[PDB]
């Protein structure tokens, strides 16, 4: 499974599987627009409960 896991990490992440593939993305404002929007929303409404969002890749999408 170790070689298979290494391939699975390198053959494109299981995000297409219901298993959450966390992928590294740039925190730049233009690149972290989802994260920046999450930060602004988190900052703006004290009644705002953050919904669970699945991060998907643009290529995957």
């Amino acid at each position: 499974p170790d070689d298979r896991s290494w391939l699975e990490h390198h053959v494109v992440h299981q995000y297409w599987t219901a298993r959450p593939s966390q992928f590294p993305h740039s925190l730049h404002l233009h690149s972290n627009l989802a994260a920046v929007w999450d930060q602004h929303l988190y900052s703006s409404d004290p009644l705002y409960v953050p919904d669970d969002r699945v991060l998907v890749t643009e290529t995957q999408v």
């Binding site: 391939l7 053959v11 494109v12 740039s26 730049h28 690149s31 890749t57 643009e58």
Partner: protein
């Protein structure tokens, strides 16, 4: 040496999930499509 290195080509693939180095990172297909060696590993 800088000029020999200058003659290096790099991938035009960019993404809007990456901004600090948009030189591509090879999405690397998966579901069959990674080829015979990956299929053998899967088997």
């Amino acid at each position: 040496l800088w000029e020999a290195a200058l003659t290096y080509e790099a991938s035009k693939r960019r993404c809007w999930e990456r901004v600090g180095c948009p030189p591509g990172h090879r999405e690397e297909p998966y579901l069959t499509e990674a080829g015979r060696d990956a299929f053998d590993k899967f088997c």
